[PDB]
Amino acid sequence: TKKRRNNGRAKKGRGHVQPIRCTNCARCVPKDKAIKKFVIRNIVEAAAVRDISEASVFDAYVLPKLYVKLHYCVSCVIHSKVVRNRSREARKDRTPPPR
Amino acid sequence: MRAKWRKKRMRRLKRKRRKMRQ
Amino acid sequence: VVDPFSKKDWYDVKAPAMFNIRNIGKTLVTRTQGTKIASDGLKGRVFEVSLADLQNDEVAFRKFKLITEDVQGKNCLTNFHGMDLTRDKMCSMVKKWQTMIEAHVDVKTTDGYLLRLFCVGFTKKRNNQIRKTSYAQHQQVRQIRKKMMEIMTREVQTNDLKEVVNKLIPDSIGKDIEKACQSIYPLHDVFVRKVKMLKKPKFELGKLMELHG
Amino acid sequence: LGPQVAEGENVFGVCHIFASFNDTFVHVTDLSGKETICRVTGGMKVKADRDESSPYAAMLAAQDVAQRCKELGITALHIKLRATGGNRTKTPGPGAQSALRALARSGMKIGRIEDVTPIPSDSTRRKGGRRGRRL
Amino acid sequence: QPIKLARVTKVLGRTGSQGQCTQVRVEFMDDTSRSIIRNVKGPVREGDVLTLLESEREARRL
RNA sequence: CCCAUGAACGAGGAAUUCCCAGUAAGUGCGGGUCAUAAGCUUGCGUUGAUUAAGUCCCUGCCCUUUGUACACACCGCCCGU
RNA sequence: CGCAAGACGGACCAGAGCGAAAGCAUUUGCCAAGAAUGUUUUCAUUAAUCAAGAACGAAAGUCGGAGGUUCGAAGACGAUCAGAUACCGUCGUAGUUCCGACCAUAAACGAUGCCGACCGGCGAUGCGGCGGCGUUAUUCCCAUGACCCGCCGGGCAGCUUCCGGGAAACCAAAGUCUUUGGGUUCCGGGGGGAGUAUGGUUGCAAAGCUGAAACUUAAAGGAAUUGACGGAAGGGCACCACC
C-alpha cells in the first residue's frame, strides 16, 4: 500500500536526481528525498557572548554567524528527532513547524 | 530466503552444471 | 635544550600607501645565522588583514592579502597580493529564492600584474513583488555575466595596480556592475568576490618605494 | 626576546582553532601564519581518548596557549576557527566554544573571528559506503 | 567574583538520568537588571534570593 | 538469673527485599493457634528517625501516534545444505 | 608559501526545467536538434496503434589502450561478541575515471501502454502570446528589461470526491462499466515446482531472450479493523521501580 503520494521524495517530471551524502552516516540519499536543515548559528555561543564581547579589541564588533547546510537520510533524521512519525492525517501537513 | 539470494544460488548451480557439461 | 624564541627578532609589517593604516602588525623570524638569513625568511609570507583594519571608515568583510617584497630597516614592506570576502558575508548573501551570477576574467594591469577578478551578483526581489522567487532567465544571466566581465576588464586593463586597489577599496567595480545590470535584471549584492594574482612582473625596488608613499 | 614596543597598544597574533570531534587544536601563530607561537591540543591535557575533544581539555589547552603567548609578548588574537571540513563534517567540535571562551577569559584580547573550515566546490567520495556507516 | 543579590523568577525543573539538579532563573537587582538562568541544588524556594558569587556560570539546558 | 569460662569482639561474594514521619529500625506486650504451649502471624503501644518532595536510567503501568508477515498474540512468527 | 595529479562541479538547487527513456547543473565558443507559443503561410488525409525488424538503454560486469586522486567488492589486520572470516576501525586489489568494442539487465516505478472526446472548483508555477492602473533602469521625445493585475495555449504538480468509480487504500482519473462496444498494442488465469529443466537463439565470458512438465498443495495473497507486541516516538505515573 502507498504510504505517500510523492513516494517520500520531491521528484516530479524528471527521471534521476543526483545523490548526496547524509551528514551523519554518509549514506547516499537522493537530494530531493533528503531532509535538509539550514543552520544559521552564532559562532560564539550565547553563554560566551558577553565574555568574548568584553575581550574584544573593537567596540561594536557584531560577531559572525555559522552557515551549515545539513543533509540527512531518513534513518538518521528520525533518530536525531529532526523529524518524527506522524498520523495518517497529519502526515499531509507540509507547513514547517512554527517554532 | 531472500529472492535475490535464491537467484544467486540458482545461478551458481547453473554455473557448476554448465562447468560439468561439455 | 635551547629556547628558540630567544634567537628571534620582531619585525614591523607595513601596508602600501593606498591604505590609511600603515602598520598592520608585527612578525617574527630567526636571526641571520650561517646559511639562513632573516630577510629571505620574510619575503613571501602573506598577511590577510581586514579592510577595516586597513581603512578606518570601510567595511570589515573585505580582506586583503599583503605579501612582503623586501625588508629594510627591520620594516617589512608589503604589496597587494589578493582580495577576498569573509566566509560569513558570502554565506549570508547566498539565499534560496534568487539567482546568483558569477563571472571571472584574467586581465593584466598596465604595470605587468596579471589578475583574476571574481565577481558575484544576486538577483533582487522588487519592493512590491508577490512572487516568492526572483529568477533571471538563462539569456539574462548570460548578459549579466557579459556585462560583469566587460566592466571588470574595462576597470582593470587601463589602470595599474595602485588604481585597481584604490577602486577595490570601496568596490567601485561592483557598484558599476550593479548599476549597469539594472536594466537586464535588478541585482542585489554585487561584489568583486575575490582577486588572485596569477603572475607579477620582475621585482623593482623603486616601484615598491613609490608604492609605500 | 619579545616586542616591547608601544606598551599601550596590542600585539596581534592569529589563533587557529581546529575543533574536530576527536580532539581540539589551539594554535596561536604569527600574523602571517608562518611563525608559530604555541600549539597545545586537548590530547596533551587529558590521558584518555574520549576526552581529547572535551570542552574541559580545550579550556586547559587555551589557558596554556594564552599563558605562553602572554609570556611571549602577544596581547591580542585574531580567531580563525575551522572544523574538519573537506567532504567530512563542517560543524566545529565540542571544544571550539570552550577554547575560545578560555582564551577570552584568561586575559587575552579577541580580534576578528572568522570560520575557515575547508569547503569543497565539490569533493571526492566520503569514507562511508553508499549505505553509510551502519553503527 | 562579585557578590550579587538576585531573585528567583521561575523554577524550570530537574535533569540527569534519575534527576539530580534544579533549574531556576534569577534576575539581578543592582546590576542593570537582566534575566540570567542558572542551575541550582537544594531547597531554593519560590522566588527566594540566590546569591551570585560570579556572573558567568550558566545552565546548559537539555 | 547468678561464677565474669573470652567468640573475624567496632558498615559485609556474585545477587538483591522493604521503606518517605510518629516511615524505617530498636523494643517489649496482647490476641490466634493453645495445655499460661511462639522462633509465626495479627494487632498494640514505647524510643525514635539519616535521606528524598525527584526521574523515567533499570523493572513495570497508563490516557496517544506509528510499524507489524504477530492473533496459541514476541515464550510470536519465521529462514537456511 | 607554492608545485603536480586525477576525481567532482557544493551552497544557488526548487514536489522547478529539458529529454523517448536511461538521464541531464562551472564559464565561453562551435555544430546539429527540439517542444510550446504566434501565424487570415503551405500541402491537403498524408493519420492512430503496431507482428516482423531497428535505434538508444543506470549501475555492475567482460576484452584491449591510457590514467589511477578519492572511495573501494576480494583480501590483510584490529576490535565489545558465546561464536565474524558481519555490522565498527586502519589499510587495501579489481573496479570507481577517460578512449574504443561488448553486455541489454534494474523497485529501468507513476509498481498506472499509446492516440482521441466529455466530465467540478481554486490558488500557484515554467514557457510563449495578448491586454491593462501604477512602481523602477540607460541623457528630457518611446519601445524594452524587473515588478504589479488579468486572459489564452501547452507543461511539471498541489484537489475534495455524496461528479463518479473502487475491496478498500485511494484515483479528476484508477471517472464517463450489468444504463456493459471510440481505435489499437502488450499482457494475467489459485499457491508452489520455477523463470527451473530442456531445445533453440545471442554473447569472449558473465549471462540475456523464448521457456515446460512430472509432482505438491487449501489456501497463498490484497485492503482495512481491533488487540497484542516493538532494543519505535510523544506525554504522564509507581519505593511490589529507580535515584
Side-chain angles (χ1 to χ4, degrees):
Chain A
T1 159
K2 229 206 184 152
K3 194 165 180 182
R4 287 162 257 269
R5 168 156 176 125
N6 66 350
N7 307 330
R9 47 187 324 163
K11 162 187 127 181
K12 308 280 193 174
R14 73 202 41 102
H16 191 245
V17 178
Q18 54 257 308
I20 61 194
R21 312 305 290 276
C22 178
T23 48
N24 273 132
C25 47
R27 213 227 183 288
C28 263
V29 44
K31 189 180 161 187
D32 53 332
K33 181 186 203 80
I35 290 90
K36 287 150 280 223
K37 261 208 303 164
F38 191 40
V39 178
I40 299 147
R41 186 193 353 121
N42 266 338
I43 278 179
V44 174
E45 78 172 317
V49 156
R50 193 201 145 300
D51 299 323
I52 304 283
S53 147
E54 268 74 91
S56 211
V57 162
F58 333 94
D59 40 329
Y61 173 55
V62 45
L63 305 127
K65 306 203 102 150
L66 254 205
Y67 305 80
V68 182
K69 247 211 96 165
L70 294 185
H71 308 295
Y72 284 126
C73 70
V74 177
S75 320
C76 283
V77 79
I78 274 156
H79 187 76
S80 324
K81 287 165 206 249
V82 168
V83 309
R84 287 177 39 198
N85 73 45
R86 314 195 272 177
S87 44
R88 157 97 93 188
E89 328 89 43
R91 270 201 266 277
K92 307 220 262 312
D93 186 55
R94 293 181 62 100
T95 311
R99 101 210 314 191
Chain B
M1 192 157 191
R2 186 203 187 146
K4 191 150 87 148
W5 305 148
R6 167 145 26 75
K7 168 140 87 157
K8 188 175 214 79
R9 247 174 46 168
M10 227 150 267
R11 266 171 205 222
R12 258 134 53 173
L13 271 175
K14 286 185 90 262
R15 248 193 253 191
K16 281 174 55 283
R17 205 128 69 238
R18 111 168 55 93
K19 170 193 114 139
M20 71 192 33
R21 287 197 43 179
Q22 327 292 359
Chain C
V1 175
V2 162
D3 185 24
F5 287 84
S6 59
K7 310 134 72 153
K8 270 194 199 326
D9 284 355
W10 282 79
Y11 280 97
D12 293 284
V13 192
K14 310 301 270 215
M18 299 87 78
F19 305 102
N20 304 353
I21 274 67
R22 284 320 218 110
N23 176 70
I24 45 185
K26 287 163 145 30
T27 198
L28 295 115
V29 81
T30 315
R31 263 162 245 151
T32 304
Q33 156 141 301
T35 285
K36 285 301 207 297
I37 87 160
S39 296
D40 280 8
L42 309 118
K43 213 167 279 299
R45 64 180 59 190
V46 184
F47 306 81
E48 205 194 46
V49 36
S50 187
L51 180 57
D53 304 338
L54 283 169
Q55 284 235 357
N56 22 359
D57 44 8
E58 274 312 331
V59 302
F61 54 79
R62 219 172 269 127
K63 289 153 326 192
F64 280 83
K65 285 171 164 267
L66 306 174
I67 186 182
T68 169
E69 316 239 47
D70 83 342
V71 194
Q72 78 260 13
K74 99 196 224 183
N75 284 354
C76 314
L77 297 210
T78 56
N79 197 351
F80 173 84
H81 197 51
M83 186 225 50
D84 220 352
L85 303 177
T86 63
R87 162 99 39 99
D88 35 67
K89 176 62 184 190
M90 182 57 195
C91 291
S92 69
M93 312 168 318
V94 188
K95 281 121 183 299
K96 175 108 162 292
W97 303 120
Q98 56 189 35
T99 303
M100 149 183 48
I101 304 107
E102 313 202 311
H104 61 83
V105 289
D106 309 34
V107 46
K108 237 183 70 149
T109 53
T110 61
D111 35 357
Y113 293 105
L114 182 73
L115 287 74
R116 189 175 283 153
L117 283 85
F118 293 88
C119 177
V120 70
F122 300 86
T123 279
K124 193 171 59 198
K125 151 184 289 187
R126 297 339 284 287
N127 84 277
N128 71 321
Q129 211 185 262
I130 301 309
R131 271 148 76 65
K132 175 180 86 183
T133 80
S134 54
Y135 293 139
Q137 285 174 350
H138 193 233
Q139 290 315 313
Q140 309 200 273
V141 166
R142 287 169 55 84
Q143 285 174 255
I144 286 171
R145 176 173 307 126
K146 218 179 78 133
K147 197 85 82 222
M148 287 171 153
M149 281 156 99
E150 174 221 353
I151 290 197
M152 296 199 281
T153 300
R154 209 207 43 235
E155 289 286 47
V156 176
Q157 70 183 357
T158 36
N159 331 113
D160 56 334
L161 196 60
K162 267 199 77 284
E163 331 203 80
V164 165
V165 182
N166 275 316
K167 284 207 224 53
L168 283 179
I169 288 177
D171 210 43
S172 172
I173 319 168
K175 288 135 144 61
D176 280 332
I177 287 158
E178 199 173 332
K179 217 172 70 78
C181 303
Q182 204 63 24
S183 325
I184 297 151
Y185 210 118
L187 295 186
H188 181 205
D189 287 308
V190 188
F191 288 99
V192 173
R193 180 198 102 222
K194 180 177 188 150
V195 179
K196 35 163 67 191
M197 195 135 33
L198 320 175
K199 76 223 189 200
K200 323 149 51 145
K202 208 187 65 54
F203 185 42
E204 265 173 50
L205 178 39
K207 217 280 189 295
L208 175 68
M209 296 339 302
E210 302 306 73
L211 191 41
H212 285 270
Chain D
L1 182 273
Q4 56 152 269
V5 182
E7 285 314 278
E9 334 191 338
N10 290 312
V11 180
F12 266 95
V14 185
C15 189
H16 305 251
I17 309 188
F18 181 16
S20 84
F21 275 84
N22 274 331
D23 87 285
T24 165
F25 288 68
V26 195
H27 190 144
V28 164
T29 206
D30 203 68
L31 219 43
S32 91
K34 212 195 177 167
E35 286 272 338
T36 134
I37 298 330
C38 53
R39 151 177 100 261
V40 192
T41 67
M44 44 213 284
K45 304 261 82 203
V46 301
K47 269 271 199 259
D49 57 45
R50 186 192 317 196
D51 323 282
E52 250 152 26
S53 35
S54 50
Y56 177 91
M59 182 213 65
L60 287 178
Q63 262 153 31
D64 294 323
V65 166
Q67 198 242 60
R68 214 273 182 290
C69 296
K70 268 189 272 143
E71 97 203 355
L72 227 42
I74 273 149
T75 284
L77 292 175
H78 293 291
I79 311 273
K80 259 149 91 136
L81 159 76
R82 80 159 260 204
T84 301
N87 61 8
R88 312 217 289 310
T89 165
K90 325 278 188 295
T91 291
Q97 225 60 243
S98 97
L100 173 67
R101 165 92 100 72
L103 280 173
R105 276 290 316 205
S106 101
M108 267 300 180
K109 288 294 172 203
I110 305 319
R112 318 248 168 223
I113 309 199
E114 166 104 320
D115 179 301
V116 297
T117 160
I119 313 281
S121 283
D122 227 26
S123 48
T124 49
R125 276 198 80 105
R126 256 181 84 169
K127 200 190 56 73
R130 96 170 317 270
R131 325 208 319 253
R133 79 186 289 255
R134 295 174 295 283
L135 171 84
Chain E
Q1 310 276 281
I3 296 187
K4 301 199 282 189
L5 302 317
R7 200 161 294 175
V8 161
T9 59
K10 220 137 64 197
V11 176
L12 265 190
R14 307 273 292 251
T15 191
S17 35
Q18 288 101 338
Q20 294 122 314
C21 185
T22 305
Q23 218 296 319
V24 310
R25 172 183 283 159
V26 295
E27 287 193 315
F28 306 121
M29 78 144 294
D30 63 333
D31 203 17
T32 319
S33 65
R34 36 199 278 274
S35 50
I36 176 186
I37 54 140
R38 77 169 325 110
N39 255 312
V40 61
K41 169 79 195 59
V44 183
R45 323 170 297 191
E46 173 82 76
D48 78 321
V49 159
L50 204 164
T51 43
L52 275 92
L53 64 148
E54 142 197 355
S55 176
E56 290 92 350
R57 205 260 164 203
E58 265 285 299
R60 54 276 300 162
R61 188 70 265 189
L62 305 159

